[PDB]
Structure formats: C-alpha cells, structure tokens
Amino acid sequence: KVFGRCELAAAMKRHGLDNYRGYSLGNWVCAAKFESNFNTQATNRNTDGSTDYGILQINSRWWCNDGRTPGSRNLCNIPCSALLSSDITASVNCAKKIVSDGNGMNAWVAWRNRCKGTDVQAWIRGCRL
Ligand SMILES: [Cl-]
Ligand SMILES: [Cl-]
C-alpha cells in the first residue's frame, strides 16, 4: 500500500511512535518518505547481500529473517516479509526496538541525511491528528 502523508502520520501516532524515545512524529514520517516513498512493499538490496524491507526499510542483516542473508541476526524475530504488509504494526514494533538500540534514528541513513536537523514538523502540517 502507498500511504498518504497524513494517513501514515495518523497510523504512526496510533501505534505509539509520536515522541517515541523523544523523536516527534514528523521525524518518523520524514524517514518513511525518504526510505520508501510511503510504500509498504518497497525492497532494496544492499551490496553486502542484505535487503531492506518496507516503509522503514528495515535491514535483514540485523532485524528480520529473509532466508537469504547468511549470518543474519533476526533481532525483531519476524520474517522480513511481515514488514511489507499494509498493516504497519510489525514495522512499527521492530522500529521501536531499533531506535532503542543506542544510535537512535541515525540507524536510518535517509533520516540522518535528509531529515535530521530540518523542520520535520512540516511533515505533519495540515494533518488531522
Ligand atoms: Cl509501544
Ligand atoms: Cl536518541
């Protein structure tokens, strides 16, 4: 499913992401925009053989099992395919574990390079939240 901006914002807020670990909702919407363009079915393969899955492009090296990433940890304990669902619950639950992990949202390259230090509030402007 391709979410609209305000639709995803409301889904994320309801799943507990707004201010999770101090990161305002605009941060999460920004990260999803630049990671996946709001498309739950986004996949991208990395040079190391791992693959990134879903609206938050969660990586199979650490977080999920895709059966083809030798030495994968599966720290969220889910098949990576569960991350490509129209229901974002699995993605959100696993994101919460990643962002508690020590480096915060810097785990998301797109967020670090495109969201961090910007007016992230703009991402939720005009939304009924
Ligand atoms: Cl929670
Ligand atoms: Cl942090």
User: DSSP letters of 15-45?
Assistant: TT-TTBTTB-HHHHHHHHHHHHTTBTT-EEE
CA–centroid distance, residue 84 to ligand 1 (Å): 20
For ligand 1, a single-atom ion, the residues with CB < 5 A are: 16
Rounded Cα distance between 115 and 124, Å, is 13
Rounded Cα distance between 16 and 92, Å, is 8
Contacts of 28 (CB under 8 A, 6+ apart): 12, 17, 18, 20, 95
- The alpha carbon torsion through 12, 15, 16, 17 (nearest 10 deg) reads -30
Resolution (angstroms) equals 2.1
Ligand closest to the CA atom of residue 103: 2
Helix or strand (DSSP H, E) at 109? helix 109-114
Q: Is 7 one of the catalytic residues?
A: no
Contacts of 123 (CB under 8 A, 6+ apart): 5, 9, 25, 26, 29, 30, 33
Ligand closest to the CA atom of residue 16: 1
Q: Six-digit token pair at 76?
A: 């969220």
Q: Which structural domains are found in the chain, ordered by start?
A: 1-129 (1.10.530.10)
CA–centroid distance, residue 25 to ligand 2 (Å): 14
Question: Exactly one of 52, 66, 87, 119 is catalytic; which is it?
Answer: 52
Annotated binding site for substrate: 101
